[PDB]
Amino acid sequence: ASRLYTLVLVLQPQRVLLGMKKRGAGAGRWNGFGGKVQEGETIEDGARRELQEESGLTVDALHKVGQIVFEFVGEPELMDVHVFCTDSIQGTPVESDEMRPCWFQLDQIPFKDMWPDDSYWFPLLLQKKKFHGYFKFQGQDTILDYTLREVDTV
Ligand SMILES: Nc1nccc(-c2ccccc2)n1
C-alpha cells in the first residue's frame, strides 16, 4: 500500500536549487520540488508538472536518480518517492505563497534545515550515483531505521 510521489533536484555543476516550503507537509525545510502523481499521468510527467508548479521552471528531459520509500509510524500509506535530476532548465525560479526557491553552492547545502534522510542520499546524488532507499520515520524529525543502496537501474 504505497502512493506515488516525485521529487526533482535541479543540479548544476556548482549549485543546486532547493525550495523552502511555506505550508503543509515539510514546511520550514528546504527540499526538492515534487508532489503526488495524478490519475492518467506518468511519473515523469508528474515530476515535470510539479517542478513548474512549485518553482516556475520548465524542464525537458528528467533523469531518474533514485527511489525512496518512506514509512511514517502510525500512518497506513507508504510514500513511494521517485527522485529525478536535471541540469537544463528554462525560466527563472519563482517565489510563491507556497514555496521560496534558492540556489545553494554544493558545499553550503543546508542539511540541518532539510529532511534528515537527505543527509544520506544527497551525497550520492552529488556524485551522480543512483539509489534505492527506505526510511522509517517517527514524526518528521526521527529516523528509526533505514536502508540505502546504490543501484545501476532505478
Ligand atoms: N527529502 C524528503 N524526505 C522525506 C520526504 C520527502 C518527500 C518528498 C516528496 C514528497 C513527499 C515527501 N522528501
Assign residue 52 the CATH number of its domain.
Answer: 3.90.79.10
Distances (CA, A) of 36 to 3, 26, 58, 91, 154: 8, 14, 18, 23, 19
**Pocket lining: 122 vs ligand 1, CB cutoff 6 Å:** no
**Pocket lining: 71 vs ligand 1, CB cutoff 6 Å:** no
* CB-neighbour burial class of residue 75 (10 A; exposed 0-12, middle 13-18, buried 19+): exposed
- How many structural domains are present in the chain? 1
Q: Which of 2, 29, 70 to mutate to test the pocket of ligand 1 (most atoms within 8 A of CB)?
A: 70
Phi, psi of 116 (to 5 degrees): -65, -25
Cell numbers for 67? 527511489
14: domain range?
A: 1-154
Experimental method reported for this structure: X-ray
